[PDB]
Paper text:
Here, we describe the design, characterization, and application of de novo helical hairpins that heterodimerize to form 4-helix bundles in cells. Starting from a rationally designed homodimer, we construct a library of helical hairpins and identify complementary pairs using bimolecular fluorescence complementation in E. coli. We characterize some of the pairs using biophysics and X-ray crystallography to confirm heterodimeric 4-helix bundles. Finally, we demonstrate the function of an exemplar pair in regulating transcription in both E. coli and mammalian cells.
We attempted to crystallize all four selected pairs and were successful with 26α/26β. The 26α/26β complex formed the targeted heterodimer of hairpins, which was confirmed as a 4-helix CC with knobs-into-holes packing using the program Socket2.51 The heterodimer has a syn topology. This is different to the parent CC-HP1.0 structure, which crystallized in an anti conformation. However, the syn conformation is consistent with the designed charge patterning of CC-HP1.0 as depicted in the helical wheels for the design, and with AlphaFold2 predictions. Moreover, although the anti and syn forms are likely close in energy, and the linkers in the split-YFP assay should be flexible enough to allow both topologies, we suggest that the syn arrangement is favored. In contrast, near-complete quenching occurred when 26β-c4CF and 26α-nMSE were mixed, demonstrating the proximity of the 4CF and MSE residues. These data are consistent with 26α/26β forming a heterodimer with a syn topology in solution as observed in the experimental X-ray crystal structure. In summary to this section, the in vitro solution-phase biophysical data confirm that the cognate pairs selected from the in vivo BiFC assay, i.e., 9α/9β, 14α/14β, 21α/21β, and 26α/26β,all form stable, helical heterodimers consistent with the targeted 4HB structures. At the lowest concentration of peptides that gave measurable CD spectra (i.e., 1 μM total peptide), second derivatives of melting curves returned melting temperatures of 43 °C for 26α, 30 °C for 26β, and 48 °C for the mixture 26α/26β. This suggests that the 26α/26β heterodimer should be well formed and stable, whereas the individual peptides should be unfolded or partially folded at concentrations close to those anticipated in cells and at the required temperature for cell experiments (37 °C).
Residue numbers in the entry:
A (entry chain C), B (entry chain D): 1 to 49
Amino acid sequence: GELEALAKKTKALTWKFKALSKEPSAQELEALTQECEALGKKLKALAQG
Amino acid sequence: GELEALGKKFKALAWKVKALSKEPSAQELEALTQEAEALGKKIKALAQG
């Protein structure tokens, strides 16, 4: 369920940070931005469950 | 609770990534990576099972 889905997303997010190049692309950083925001929104929604 | 608070913290991190501009310093990328990893540790603990 939702816990495990958010734990996997969080792991994916942390690894994308860890795997960044020294000079990351604009697009990579947009993707990271979006993945942080998504996870924050999903946590808040589940909080209001 | 913790879900709400962790949610807000991911949104905060999203802003930090959003603010990055071309060639972010290594210190900044490492700072943001460590914040992700710290939030990751919290989520792992919260989602166990």
